[model samples]
Target: QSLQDPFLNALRRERVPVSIYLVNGIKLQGQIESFDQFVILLKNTVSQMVYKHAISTVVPSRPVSH
Candidate 1:
């Protein structure tokens, strides 16, 4: 699916799992629950949350690994 925002689009369109790298040097590992323009709601061992702009990096949690 073609989406406007690259960040949210990864989760919604590709249906791909993601790994979030936060600005403070902590990695957020979970399933993409839902999100808006600001905060992203995630699911993990417990309920987790992350800010849109606060994201340092975003990568596919289940990318094709060798």
Candidate 2:
């Protein structure tokens, strides 16, 4: 129940770039802007508000240290 936030926070704190895959098989690239339980804000040239349920995977550009 309390697992997702820490992983996300690490990315947000470090401003790590990430590739996010949605259930529709479309891949998105950005650094995380912010997130809540239901959605994530992704930013590259602009911002994309992504639904968490629609996401399949989140791949970071580099390893994130805790």
Candidate 3:
């Protein structure tokens, strides 16, 4: 049941900020535009979190459901 704890008390009380940044690694000769990509990236990220932190007996909320 300890693994099912979402408070992360198994470790120390720490505050971590999740972040994403895009840098110019490969300069592509194209239109530099702004777009919404968080939704696409969130799919994979949320899946990983569920697989790693979710408990078998607990059903995740609709927003995090598979």
Question: Which candidate number maximizes lDDT?
Answer: 2
Question: How many residue pairs collide in each prediction?
Answer: 0, 0, 0
Candidate 1 global CA lDDT score = 0.70
lDDT per residue for candidate 3 within 1-66, as digits (tens), equals 444244222111222222222242221121112212221111222322222222222222222211
User: What tens digits encode model 2's per-residue C-alpha lDDT throughout 1-66?
Assistant: 666898999999999999999999999999999999899999988899999999999989999986
Q: Output the better candidate (1/3) by TM-score.
A: 1
Clashing pairs in 2: none
Order the numbered candidates by TM-score, best leading.
Answer: 2, 1, 3
Model 1 lDDT at residue 5? 57
Candidate 2 C-alpha error for residue 19, in Å: 0.4
Identify the superior model by TM-score, candidate 1 or candidate 2: 2
How much is the lDDT of residue 11 in candidate 2? 91
lDDT of 1 at 31: 68
Worst 10 residues of 1 by lDDT: 1-10
Report every candidate's CA lDDT.
0.70, 0.94, 0.23
Decreasing lDDT order of the candidates: 2, 1, 3
lDDT of 1 by residue, 2-66 (tens): 34255565674566677889998888877677777788777778767788788887777665322
